[PDB]
Structure 1
Amino acid sequence: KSKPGVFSFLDPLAYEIWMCIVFAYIGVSVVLFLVSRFSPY
């Protein structure tokens, strides 16, 4: 009786995709902050 793993809900996407999702989240947030709070307008 295959006991489903906790964090089996992540199985549809590979570990690399989640990793790069986190990386892209950080990059997007930083670029947004930058391009919103740089110009002394």
Structure 2
Amino acid sequence: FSKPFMSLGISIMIKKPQKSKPGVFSFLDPLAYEIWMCIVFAYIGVSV
């Protein structure tokens, strides 16, 4: 071998943690979409 002309080391590569894309409907996330309908169909039902 010759003289070391470039210094380096073993490091780690993972995929970069992606851009946090919430979506335009992120606030409706902790409840499933079924429940939001079942609220509204029961919202009309109680008011009827």
- TM tier, smaller: 0.5 to 0.7
TM-score, L = length of structure 1? 0.66
Aligned Cα root-mean-square deviation (Å): 0.7
Runs of 4+ in 1 over 3 A off after TM superposition: none
Q: % of aligned pairs identical?
A: 100
| Structure exhibiting the larger radius of gyration computed from Cα positions | 2
- Count of aligned pairs between the two proteins: 30
Unaligned runs of 5+ in 2: 1-18
TM-score, L = length of structure 2? 0.58
